[PDB]
Amino acid sequence: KVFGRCELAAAMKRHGLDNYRGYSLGNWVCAAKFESNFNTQATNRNTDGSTDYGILQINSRWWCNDGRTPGSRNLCNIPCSALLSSDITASVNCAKKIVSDGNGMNAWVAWRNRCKGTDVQAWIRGCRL
């Protein structure tokens, strides 16, 4: 599924991400835009044999199990397939662990390169939230 802007903002707010670890909802929507273009089925293969999955491009070496990544730790204790659902619960629960891993949202490369420092509340202006 390709979410709409406010559709994803409302989903992320219902799941507890607005100002989680002090990151306003606009940061999370922006991160999704630049990581996945709002596509829940997005996948990216890395040269290290890991893959990034779903709306927030969660990595198969550290966070989820795809059964094909060497050195995998599965710190979110979740199959990588759950992170491709239209039900964003598992990607949100994993995101809350990631954001707590010592780097805040700097864990998301596209956030650091496209969203950080910007007027991220533009991603939620107009939404019923």
């Binding site: 599924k1 219902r14 829940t40 491709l84 239209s86 039900d87 619960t89």
Partner: protein, 240 residues
Amino acid sequence: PDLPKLVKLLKSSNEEILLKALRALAEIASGGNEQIQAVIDAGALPALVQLLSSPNEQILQEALWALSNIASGGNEQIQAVIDAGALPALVQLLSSPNEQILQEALWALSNIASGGNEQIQAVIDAGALPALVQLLSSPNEQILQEALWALSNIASGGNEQIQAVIDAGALPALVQLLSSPNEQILQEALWALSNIASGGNEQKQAVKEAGALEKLEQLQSHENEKIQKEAQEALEKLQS
């Protein structure tokens, strides 16, 4: 049956080949949740979903029965149907000129909406609710009953999901249907309103503004004792 071979047959452009494989998948998916899981595990759902676009109505009917049966499983099975992208085509099929196709799409939606709040939410986001409210004015009593069951399921969610049903303008039709000469229509309307009445004070207040109270009071003395208790219990949730 070989499920992988059934699923590969759905790569066919041949309409006779597509109809025989769809029929077999549908029958297997009727056999309970382990059978549903085998159909899912074989990769059936992407092709079942693409086929909801078949201009061929018999292929469409079979694909809907398969999807409907899969969506009778547990919440993760429903979620796989959602994830495969069924909902937009299902909602478009509520506008089918074929009443049989309409009924089947409505049944599939009803089953998806019988899941948890995330499954209900998918149904709302896909834009089912205004169509379902329209269908409460169907001359076809089967269509009306299935539309009421789907609404009642949606209204079994959280307060925001209830409020989506209220915001789609369900309440006038529902209060009206408490006067149906059909006792099954009445019971389903009553169930829907009873679910709406389990929401917060705003939801309860909307049910009262729509004139539910006068009619629920009347129904405490309906001839049917199950309707009496349903009405007595809806009233208790509102009075609360």
